Design an enzyme around this catalytic site. Structure first.
Site, PDB file in Angstrom:
ATOM      1  N   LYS A  63      18.364 -22.757  13.803  1.00  0.00           N
ATOM      2  CA  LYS A  63      18.244 -22.861  15.328  1.00  0.00           C
ATOM      3  C   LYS A  63      18.284 -24.244  15.650  1.00  0.00           C
ATOM      4  O   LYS A  63      18.843 -24.565  16.779  1.00  0.00           O
ATOM      5  CB  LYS A  63      16.830 -22.319  15.694  1.00  0.00           C
ATOM      6  CG  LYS A  63      16.897 -20.560  15.626  1.00  0.00           C
ATOM      7  CD  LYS A  63      15.696 -20.121  15.914  1.00  0.00           C
ATOM      8  CE  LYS A  63      15.749 -18.560  16.084  1.00  0.00           C
ATOM      9  NZ  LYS A  63      16.091 -17.685  14.821  1.00  0.00           N
ATOM     10  N   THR A  92       0.936 -12.116  30.697  1.00  0.00           N
ATOM     11  CA  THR A  92      -0.182 -12.516  29.706  1.00  0.00           C
ATOM     12  C   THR A  92      -0.787 -13.907  29.978  1.00  0.00           C
ATOM     13  O   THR A  92      -1.841 -14.347  29.397  1.00  0.00           O
ATOM     14  CB  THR A  92       0.591 -12.960  28.315  1.00  0.00           C
ATOM     15  OG1 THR A  92       1.428 -13.624  28.355  1.00  0.00           O
ATOM     16  CG2 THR A  92       1.177 -11.568  27.582  1.00  0.00           C
ATOM     17  N   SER A 171     -10.673 -30.181  23.873  1.00  0.00           N
ATOM     18  CA  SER A 171      -9.603 -31.511  24.003  1.00  0.00           C
ATOM     19  C   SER A 171     -10.571 -32.791  24.294  1.00  0.00           C
ATOM     20  O   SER A 171     -10.071 -34.059  23.985  1.00  0.00           O
ATOM     21  CB  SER A 171      -8.643 -31.179  24.822  1.00  0.00           C
ATOM     22  OG  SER A 171      -9.083 -30.682  26.086  1.00  0.00           O
TER      23      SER A 171
HETATM   24 MG   LIG Z   1     -10.713 -26.236  25.700  1.00  0.00          MG
HETATM   25 NA    NA Z   2      -3.781 -13.501  29.163  1.00  0.00          NA
END
Ligand SMILES: [Mg+2]
Ligand code: NA
Ligand SMILES: Nc1ccn([C@H]2C[C@H](O)[C@@H](COP(=O)(O)OP(=O)(O)OP(=O)(O)O)O2)c(=O)n1
Ligand SMILES: [Cl-]
Ligand SMILES: [Cl-]
Ligand SMILES: [Cl-]
Ligand SMILES: [Mg+2]
Ligand SMILES: [Mg+2]
Ligand code: NA
Ligand code: NA
Length: 326
Positions: A63, A92, A171
């Site tokens: 790929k 989603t 984060s």
């Molecule tokens: Mg977070």
């Molecule tokens: Na979701």
DNA sequence: GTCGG
DNA sequence: GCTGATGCGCC
DNA sequence: CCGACGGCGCATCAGC
């Protein structure tokens, strides 16, 4: 960034495997390859060169050869031109709709935000909330706002009991200039591996934060984990702040270092750290690091006095949170 | 999809 | 109710 | 149908 074409390609494939194929291990393989490639400090000039890295095999190397030759991948072209795939993948992104519910919805012709709104009776509470704040939850949080949120959280927790200790992880703790959500690690002296003395230690904190209107909705809540929504208060005639996701996790105080390691992440750093732990004969979770005995079963928790001590057991050079991001 | 028993 | 599997999510 | 792959909290469903 260096090798951004390739890591974008592999990420997009990863998300396809997770959301459309329901192939979580292919998702994880694509995630791992992108991870190794991103930290590789040279420009990848061929798939063969990439193949040398751990987690890149033949099919990904091929790929990478295509993309390096053409600047695209036909497989991803086809996926993008498939309306059904695109709809499933898109759904989603609603908090509460996973790959299974997304396929169910699209099978019933529910394909757009509009459709979800018209069929709100088909959604559970979690999903309704994900939908209500869909736009807001797509946005990142500037570090400036994270500081304000931290300050509200620490102050209100201080007001419930000064023995609580709250640490913003994710984060943020890794020093990012913006975050996806707020992740809060909470400890109290009464809750340890040896003993739960107080009831409702998390509950108390949540209700206080709801009382001052910081936490606005609840997605799920149990004795040690809270998933929900919060919002900074804003000034007059100035648009409101977006609603944000907030996660709170109550950890046994004697297990702070294992917990803070888990909750600081990143997610792929965590999985890779745990993977290296297994080949070293250990197993790590948010609570403990244990030695693996033959028969598979893990033994007693090893003593830990720092984040680094966990790195030590598995012979990784310590990584500062700065350097745990992808 | 990749790697290792 | 239970145990176990699934679906959602977290790093 | 080589199987493991990182590990788990909360909600809910199947088969008792
Ligand atoms: Mg977070
Ligand atoms: Na979701
Ligand atoms: N790296 C691999 C490849 C295959 N298998 C599995 C798949 C089969 O269920 C089993 C036996 O497959 P083969 O008969 O192909 O393996 P042989 O070694 O017998 O093949 P050959 O005749 O090429 O030597 O091993 C495995 O465990 N590890
Ligand atoms: Cl898979
Ligand atoms: Cl610990
Ligand atoms: Cl444990
Ligand atoms: Mg989070
Ligand atoms: Mg995340
Ligand atoms: Na490789
Ligand atoms: Na140490």
């Amino acid at each position: 960034t260096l090798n951004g074409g390739i890591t974008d390609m592999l990420t997009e494939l990863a998300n396809f495997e997770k959301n459309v194929s329901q192939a979580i291990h292919k998702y994880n393989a694509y995630r791992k390859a992108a991870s190794v490639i991103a930290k590789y400090p040279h420009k990848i000039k061929s798939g063969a060169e990439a193949k040398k890295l751990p987690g890149v095999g033949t099919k990904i190397a091929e790929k990478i050869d295509e993309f390096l030759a053409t600047g695209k991948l036909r497989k991803l072209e086809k996926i993008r031109q498939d309306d059904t795939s695109s709809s499933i993948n898109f759904l989603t992104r609603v908090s509460g709709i996973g790959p299974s519910a997304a396929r169910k919805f699209v099978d019933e012709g529910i394909k757009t935000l509009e459709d979800l709104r018209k069929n709100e009776d088909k959604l559970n509470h979690h999903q309704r909330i994900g939908l209500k704040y869909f736009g807001d939850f797509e946005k990142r949080i500037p570090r400036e706002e994270m500081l304000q949120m931290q300050d509200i959280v620490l102050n209100e927790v201080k007001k419930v009991d000064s023995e609580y200790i709250a640490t913003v992880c994710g984060s943020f703790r890794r020093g990012a200039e913006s975050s996806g959500d707020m992740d809060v690690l909470l400890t109290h002296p009464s809750f340890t591996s040896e003993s739960t003395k107080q009831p409702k230690l998390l509950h108390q904190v949540v209700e206080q934060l709801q009382k001052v209107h910081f936490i606005t909705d609840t997605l799920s809540k149990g004795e040690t984990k809270f998933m929900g929504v919060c919002q900074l208060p804003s000034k007059n005639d100035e648009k409101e702040y977006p609603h944000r996701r907030i996660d709170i996790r109550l950890i046994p105080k004697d297990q702070y270092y294992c917990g803070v390691l888990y909750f600081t992440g990143s997610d792929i750093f965590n999985k890779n750290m745990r993977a290296h732990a297994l080949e070293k004969g250990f197993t790590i979770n948010e609570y403990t690091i244990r030695p693996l005995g033959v028969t598979g079963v893990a033994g007693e928790p090893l003593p830990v006095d720092s984040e680094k001590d966990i790195f030590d057991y598995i012979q990784w050079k310590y990584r500062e949170p700065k350097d745990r991001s992808e």
